[PDB]
Amino acid sequence: EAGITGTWYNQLGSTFIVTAGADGALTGTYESAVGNAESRYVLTGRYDSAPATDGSGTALGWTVAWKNNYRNAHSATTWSGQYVGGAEARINTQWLLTXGTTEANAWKSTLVGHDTFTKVK
Amino acid sequence: EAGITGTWYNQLGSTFIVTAGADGALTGTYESAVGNAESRYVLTGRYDSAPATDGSGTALGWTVAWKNNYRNAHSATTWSGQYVGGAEARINTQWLLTXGTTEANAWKSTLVGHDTFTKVKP
Ligand SMILES: O=C(O)CCCC[C@@H]1SC[C@@H]2NC(=O)N[C@@H]21
Ligand SMILES: O=C(O)CCCC[C@@H]1SC[C@@H]2NC(=O)N[C@@H]21
């Protein structure tokens, strides 16, 4: 899926590089502009490979665990969202970032936010 | 890693079958007991393959897009959470289910909830 496949940036200046496979897979790398992160992290996810043709977005999501060969934040973010095609293509998401915690600190394990991604072209 | 790998069930009786690669990959299938869903769906995700040394949980997350050979709900769920090992291992998660919508209806595109998984068969 050519629509989704490519390089994307969000409002924070973070970079998402993705390939959308015919079987519904998302694969690529994510670089965050912020937080306890440096360089590129592996991402994996899924997308609706037979969307409605109806002026609806394409549902998708992906996960980054924030461990690479440079740093380990002991945390993972999932972005859940939809892809909106056309000339000014966007991925509108909400996200959940969970950090590994003790049982006593589990109530404060999870941040929530929203990122909007613009495709670079 | 052996602890996350296995067959889990949540409070709804959904079945989450997963394998944790040495490297950080999660790969498996998900069968939901509820919603616009039947049979198994492909899932992939990631987890911290070197968790902290202080008895913290293991951060992890995965996605399912709700299309398989039977059905397509035009929606995707991501679970974000942590694995907590020991005697009664648990994966405690919060999730976001986004349905494809018009931009008009984008405000009402995303459900949020919370699932807890154990390896006890319903
Ligand atoms: O600090 C961490 O634990 C890891 C980096 C987190 C960066 C987050 S993920 C959601 C939000 N979107 C971004 O592009 N960066 C932040
Ligand atoms: O109805 C849909 O669009 C697809 C199925 C959604 C099932 C959800 S995912 C979150 C929650 N946890 C489950 O095990 N089932 C529901």
Swiss-Prot record, chain A:
Role this protein plays: The biological function of streptavidin is not known. Forms a strong non-covalent specific complex with biotin (one molecule of biotin per subunit of streptavidin).
Compartment(s) of residence: Secreted
Keyword Cell wall biogenesis/degradation included in the entry's annotation: no
Domain of life according to the entry: Bacteria
Record text on subunit structure and interactions: Homotetramer.
Organism: Streptomyces avidinii
Binding site for biotin: 30, 41, 79, 95, 107
Disulfide bond positions: none
Transmembrane segment boundaries: none
Residue numbers covered by motif Cell attachment site: 46-48
One of the record's GO molecular function terms: biotin binding
Keyword Lipid metabolism: no
Annotated keywords: Biotin, Secreted, Signal
Predominant localisation class: secreted
Family: Belongs to the avidin/streptavidin family.
Ranges for domain Avidin-like: 1-121
GO cellular component, one term: extracellular region
Name of the protein in its database record: Streptavidin
